[PDB]
């Protein structure tokens, strides 16, 4: 089987993507932001307290002829962003993009954070690291990957993330037509759970390539690219004006700028972010302070390499005996 869904900016900034989804019977359409950097897959719905919701479309378990509660399961995640949501959990049927999996753990969110509530556009998550990560007690619950993996043509999914427009997650099969030149595999280590990799080095703009290994995570419910920190001033040195904010939370910029671009190694090839990718906009409505789409990684523990890299690539999640990623420019 394969499936293939189109996913949509929830804004004029890509801030996040949305993918419809399909859950019970009668099916019941969500639009979940699907996350290669976590692994439940849980939704506003009926039981969330009805004042933190807040123009989201909810899912109802008792109108879904199958769904079954999973008897004293519960979960509960908190994300790097601090948000955090929980509640308890029903198996149901789920399709994406015509892909089904059966008795797939929808986790229903009795309780969100308000950077949850506040996000209309956003029905909850799906999310697409490894299993291992999780959140359901007592017992741990599969990624819709994992359940759908051995029904699939091939053991991968994708991400074609768009620049402001839309792009498609395919399951099952690499799109031939979606991308240029050929696909870079390169190694994933699991042991934390994430699609973890090591990129062989960057360059800023036109300047030479530094080769350096940067560990990181493919992350598709991050927005941003957080780097270490010496990676990260050598890109905002050359933007005049740019600065680092402890007001504002990381580099800002003048908005007349026009921006470098920043190229990132996959073993020998490179993906190029163009500038305008690293965009993200004024500070507050009608500021000539425009927020960096490129932040340091010193405070989260990790490196991420999140929509404003992913979206300058196809890349191929592949969820083979030894897991690998793959990417390509397109």
């Known amino acids: 089987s394969t499936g293939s869904a189109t996913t949509t900016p929830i804004d004029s900034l890509d801030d996040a993507y949305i993918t419809p989804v399909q859950i019970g019977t009668p099916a019941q359409t969500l639009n ?17 307290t009805a004042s933190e919701v807040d123009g989201q479309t909810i899912y109802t378990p008792s109108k879904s002829t199958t769904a079954k509660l999973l008897s004293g399961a519960t979960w509960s995640i908190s994300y790097g962003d601090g948000s955090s949501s929980s509640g308890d959990v029903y198996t149901d049927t789920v399709s994406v993009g015509g892909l089904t999996v059966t008795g797939q753990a929808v986790e229903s969110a009795k309780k969100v954070s308000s950077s949850f509530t506040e996000d209309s556009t956003i029905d909850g ?61 390169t190694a994933v280590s699991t042991k934390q759970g994430f ?6 080095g960057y360059a800023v703009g036109s300047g030479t390539f530094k080769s350096t290994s940067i560990d990181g995570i493919a992350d598709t419910g991050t ?12 890109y905002w040195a050359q933007v005049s004006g740019a600065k680092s904010s402890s007001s504002v939370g990381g580099y800002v910029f003048p908005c007349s700028a026009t921006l470098p671009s920043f190229t990132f190694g996959v073993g020998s090839a490179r993906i ?27 405070g989260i523990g990790i490196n991420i390499f999140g929509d404003v890299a992913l979206k300058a690539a196809f890349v191929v999640f592949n969820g083979a005996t030894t897991p690998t990623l793959g990417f390509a420019s397109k």
């Open 223 to 234: 927005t941003l690219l957080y780097l270490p920190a010496t990676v990260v001033s050598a």
């Open 272 to 298: 190029v972010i163009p500038g305008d990718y690293i965009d993200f906009g004024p500070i507050s409505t009608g500021s000539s302070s425009c927020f960096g789409g490129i932040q340091s990684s010193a």
């Open 125 to 185: 998550l799906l999310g697409l690291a490894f299993s291992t990560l999780n959140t359901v007690s007592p017992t741990q619950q599969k990624t819709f990957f994992d359940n759908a993996k051995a029904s699939l043509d091939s053991p991968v999914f994708t991400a074609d993330l768009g620049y402001h427009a839309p792009g498609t997650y395919n399951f099952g099969f690499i799109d031939t037509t979606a991308y240029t030149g050929s696909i870079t595999y």
């Open 32 to 48: 979940l932001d699907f996350d290669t950097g976590s692994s439940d897959l849980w939704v506003f719905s009926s039981e969330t």
């Open 195 to 200: 699609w973890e990799w090591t990129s062989t």
